């Protein structure tokens, strides 16, 4: 019973059937066309999904840049090819980006000047860490969950 | 103790007085005190001891010569075997709170004397030992019980005991002491014979065996003690033990053992109690019995 | 220090055994149930009679209410 | 200073000498149980009263519905919320029980433990009544404006006593908010006075249902009273989960499950069975002034029942008459509860008045009467 | 013997009381829960959702 | 008994504990500190409740209402004020309260020392919820700084944080509970405040000597009850003082502002009072290890008794440790500063030292320079 009655008013303080259901959003990765981006909301903050044609694999995928001030390799935490999904929220003072124009054709936050390419990450820009990056899983094609 | 055994084995002979009823003494009649004599004062059921400048062969005469009447069937050979006494964890409290000061008597039921074990016991009793207001080394002693009645001023006296009978025995202790520190006091003593069970070390026990020794060469010190040891070794153990073998069987003693074979006897036992004077704080059994567990 | 100050007692005996060497709930029939009654008994003409003396009340007192609501034909005996 | 470790440590000292080596009669009853359950109760509905205000909004637009949502969307919250709500109940009736226990043995000796006893009645009702207030629903709603309307009946220094107990004209959210708060320290206050209650108590120890000097033999709180005391809970525990567990609302009125609003007024407004006694007192008097006198009084009287004790002997245990005159006025409450969860219409009105008018009459004449005139027959 | 079995290795010392109290308890639950809710459901047949599931999960459209 | 506050169950908790109390002759002005603190809570406790009345505790409501508390209710504003600079009144007196048992070795008083430093304990943390409520942009985010270094635990972190929020991040789920425990604590701190009078009244007071005072005690009424009160005054009056005519001298602005989890303040930093800590966390690059140095920098106060190798108790007649005490003083302030700026040089390594300097004067220094210094003497 002691047992029983404290997990119940335990698990009281944790999150609630509401909260829980706002917590996860799911997008379709058989709807979206090569190169435009479209940005969704999720835990408040924005969230960036573009599927990018093929000048993003070979483009900024060879980016040869020096002492970077971030560690972020496309094999540690990246799955998806032409996908790629991240944050919408400047590691700055937690301004959003853009996704229309920019200096190096990414993303750009019009609060600091901070320009994101377009595999987000800083580049010309103040913001230390990189656009903050989610957890996923794969077991839907067309399909793909964060939360 | 008479309170103790009323109550220790109740509904069984050792639950009777040696002075016997009030009744009894006044009704008893030329008949029935000759019975007893008669049933009771038989050859094979005594032992004509001695000790001092006498040879056995001189004595063992005198003795083939007055120690007369030959029995003709096989009863009057046959040693009559006791019906068993029950124990019986509980208490009787006489109370007057006129009386100075209370006594206090718990115990658990003993071995017998047979069992070898006594022998431990006896050195566990060595380690809480005793005290009365006049022992000299006062807060030094070496009995933790004794010490803390000091410190405290627990009580006046206390004594450890081991009485052994024949198929059975009480084993505990006794304190006296003013009406309001009964408690501390008890609550201490419990407390004692629980370490016994649980933390005892080789340092007292070491000096256990050594008293223990002194105290058994003590009880044979002249030639009234020395007989009076004989008719009982014999009588009670069958032969006679000797100081040689007595002390071997002491000296292989050690913690380990002891905190075994109180285990055995004290812990988690319902105990007896004898409570008498103005004893308004010593109360309830209950407690007094979880005192028999954990410390 | 409460227990020692309360009160002065003297000549008194009490002898009682451990719990494990007696009996938990000991004679229930012999002795329980008919104290369980005995107990009962004496005091229902006291109890109970106020308790009963006021269901009435509660039924009158609702069961008259009741008919106090249904209409009487006699209201409407020339009404034609 | 000392040998164990539980009178020489100025805590243990108190965990200890007040509730294990504590000396209590050995004769004391099931009717003596009640005082721990009204602790542990206490140490309960706290518990349970955080927990929901964890989740709460006391907002007159956001109250009902947070209250709803904790039952519909909080872990366990709607469990959480019945036991609370239930909690006020068994509270009551542990707490009447306990008061009826000391009428029938003359604790009210003890007039300081019974008057801190009183009072802590006095905080755990006004609790309540906010707490109640507190869900936003209909009768919650009108609860409050009924009986707040009351102190308008003062004279002159009331017509304002009220405006400014509701922070506004009527019963609106500048109320609400206060009424949570005060929700939210009662409780507190509750618990304080209990140990002021618990020490004025230890001061001469528990009356026993004989009513002669326990001394001649006291036992240990523990086990005896420990081990007691804990059956006794579970003898309670259960009807209080099981109607808590089985029918939630069977206790209270829907009307609360209708958003409060000002403007439409609910057939019948009756508070909670526990008040009912008192509602039904109020109601019998037509004055608004008057009803009110007459339910503080319903209630204040019990400080006058120490000065209103005739009897040589202190337990009606060896008294019948008295008795007797006891358990009519028992049922005499339970009239005026029923009395309270009907209309104001014959007969009930009369019947009302009467049972009101019988209940005073008792504490005030019959009591100390018979109490003389019962002395007298064994001769003293 | 049971009792004495029991009494000796188990409520014995303090600690192997408790110790066994835990793992002991360990069990009721586990196997309590269960019975109970297996009861409860039984009461209850073909009422759940637990029941009436197969005929939506996978068999239709 | 004769008169009636001996044998009355109250009135002899009323007298003996403020009125026939016995106390040294010698205590100086740092023993004030004990009632002021008491008086503080009172007053706390009272205006928080007076506010809580008109207070909303809802994500959309929780600035709006304070601010109408301040611009609507009758002297709004001013119990307002009360309460928030009540705030810091109370952790000055802590402080002086805490140094003063530290530079009399008060904390010889084993229990009324662990107490206290419950106390404190709660009080920051009170204090911490408290801050939340209005909702504003320091008070939001203060929010998810701290609670988020919690993460920082392995394993039981990602856990024990979103259950503290009671969701993903901060958000009314917290607000609310956050309420509630602020509506609670300060309870729970009158409380302990009991047990802590409590232990002391054990042994009575230490006095500034370090030597026994039975030789010549004196009754807390008139002496230390007068005392008292004109220590009350000397105090309440700057408390006012700031409170009635510069209010937000205190406060950072940022709070002025409500909430909003998209965009981040300049610059995130707490009150005075939790600024020597801040600079602690921040010294240690590392979550985990800032997060420990944070609970340390205070929870350290628990050793400080068993750090005591003085043969003397006060400070009063050992030079040596006096300076030692001294620069530890100094030291806090140091600390408090480098808090209030942000993380460029000079003032990353200036703040590291600080805080190195810190725990070894606690940890090391005190306890060497009082062997030593016992040597001096001789002994
Ligand atoms: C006020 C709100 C009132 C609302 C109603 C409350 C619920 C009513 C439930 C009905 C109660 C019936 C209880 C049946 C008990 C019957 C019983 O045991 O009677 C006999 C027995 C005789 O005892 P002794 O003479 O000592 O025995 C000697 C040793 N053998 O009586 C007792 O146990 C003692 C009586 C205590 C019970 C009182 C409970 C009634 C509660 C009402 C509260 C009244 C107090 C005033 C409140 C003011 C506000
Ligand atoms: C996954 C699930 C498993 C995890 C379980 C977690 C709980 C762990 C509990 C550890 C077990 C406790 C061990 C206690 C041992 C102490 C002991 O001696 O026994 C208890 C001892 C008895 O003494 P003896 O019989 O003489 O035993 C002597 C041994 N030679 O004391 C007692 O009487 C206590 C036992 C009775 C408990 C009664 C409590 C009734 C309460 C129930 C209400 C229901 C719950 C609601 C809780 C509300 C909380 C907000
Ligand atoms: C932590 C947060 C820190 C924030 C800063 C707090 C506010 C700082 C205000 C400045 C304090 C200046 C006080 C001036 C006092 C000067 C003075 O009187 O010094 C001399 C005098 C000499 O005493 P005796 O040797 O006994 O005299 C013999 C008899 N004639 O010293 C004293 O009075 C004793 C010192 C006590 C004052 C301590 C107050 C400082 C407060 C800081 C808290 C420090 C403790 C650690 C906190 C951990 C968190
Ligand atoms: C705030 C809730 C209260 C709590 C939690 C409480 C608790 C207790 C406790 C623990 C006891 C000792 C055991 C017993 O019940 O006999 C006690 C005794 C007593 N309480 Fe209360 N009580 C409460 C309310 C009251 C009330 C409202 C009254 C009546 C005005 C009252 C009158 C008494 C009396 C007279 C005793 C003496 C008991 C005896 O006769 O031995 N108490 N109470
Ligand atoms: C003195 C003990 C307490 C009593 C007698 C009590 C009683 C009640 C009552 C009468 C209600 C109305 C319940 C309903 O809707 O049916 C209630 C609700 C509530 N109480 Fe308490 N309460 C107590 C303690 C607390 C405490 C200590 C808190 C928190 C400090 C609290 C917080 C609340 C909240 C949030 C509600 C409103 C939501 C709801 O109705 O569930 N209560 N309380
Ligand atoms: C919750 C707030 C607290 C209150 C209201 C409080 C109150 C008091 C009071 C009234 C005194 C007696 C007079 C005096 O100040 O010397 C006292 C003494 C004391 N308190 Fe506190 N205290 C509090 C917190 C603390 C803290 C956080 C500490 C430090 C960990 C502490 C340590 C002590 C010590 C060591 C004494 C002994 C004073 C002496 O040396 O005579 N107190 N406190
Ligand atoms: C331990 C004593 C207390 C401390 C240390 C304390 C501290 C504070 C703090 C740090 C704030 C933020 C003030 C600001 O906006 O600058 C605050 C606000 C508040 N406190 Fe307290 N508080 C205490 C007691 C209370 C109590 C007892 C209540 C009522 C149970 C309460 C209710 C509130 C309310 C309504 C607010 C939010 C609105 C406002 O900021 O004015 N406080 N408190
Ligand atoms: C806010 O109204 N709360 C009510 C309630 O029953 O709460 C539990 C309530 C609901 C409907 C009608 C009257 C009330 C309050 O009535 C009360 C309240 C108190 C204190 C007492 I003394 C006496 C009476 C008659
Ligand atoms: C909710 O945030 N409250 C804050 C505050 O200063 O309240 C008075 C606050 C505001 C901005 C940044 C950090 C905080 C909390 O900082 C704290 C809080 C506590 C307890 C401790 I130990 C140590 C630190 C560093
Ligand atoms: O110690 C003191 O003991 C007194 C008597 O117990 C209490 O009234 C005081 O509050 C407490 O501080
Ligand atoms: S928040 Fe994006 S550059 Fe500053
Ligand atoms: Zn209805
Ligand atoms: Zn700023």
Redesign the interface.
Known sequence: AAKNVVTQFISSLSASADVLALSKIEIKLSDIPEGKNVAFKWRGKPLFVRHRTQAEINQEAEVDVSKLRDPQHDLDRVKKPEWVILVGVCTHLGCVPIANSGDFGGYYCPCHGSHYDASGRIRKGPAPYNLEVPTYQFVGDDLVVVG | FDYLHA?AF?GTALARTVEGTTENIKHLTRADLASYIDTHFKAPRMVLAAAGGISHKELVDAARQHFSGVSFTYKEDAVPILPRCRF???????????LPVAHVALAVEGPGWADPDNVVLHVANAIIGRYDRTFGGGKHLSSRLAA?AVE?KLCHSFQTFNTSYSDTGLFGFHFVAD??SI??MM??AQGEWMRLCTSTTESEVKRAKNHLRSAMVAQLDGTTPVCETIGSHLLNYGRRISLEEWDSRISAVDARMVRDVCSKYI??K??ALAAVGPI??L?????I?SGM??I | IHFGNLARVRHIITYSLSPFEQRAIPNIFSDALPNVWRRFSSQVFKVAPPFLGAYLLYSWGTQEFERLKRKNPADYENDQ | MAPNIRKSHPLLKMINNSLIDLPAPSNISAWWNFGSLLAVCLMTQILTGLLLAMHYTADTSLAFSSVAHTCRNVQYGWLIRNLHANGASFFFICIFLHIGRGLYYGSYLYKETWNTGVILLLTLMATAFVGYVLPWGQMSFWGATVITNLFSAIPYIGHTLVEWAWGGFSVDNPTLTRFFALHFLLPFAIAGITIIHLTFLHESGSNNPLGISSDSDKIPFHPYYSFKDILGLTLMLTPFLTLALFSPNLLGDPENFTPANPLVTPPHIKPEWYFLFAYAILRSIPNKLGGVLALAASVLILFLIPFLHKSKQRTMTFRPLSQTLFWLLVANLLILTWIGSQPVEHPFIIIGQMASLSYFTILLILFPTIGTLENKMLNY | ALLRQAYSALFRRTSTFALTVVLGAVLFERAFDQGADAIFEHLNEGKLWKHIKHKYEASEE
Request: proline share 6%; hydrophobic share 25%.
């Open positions: 109550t109740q019986t964890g509980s208490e009787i409290r006489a109370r007057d709170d006129a803390l405290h009406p309001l408690d501390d609550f201490c812990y988690d319902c105990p308004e704080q109360l309830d059994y209950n407690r019995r567990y954990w």
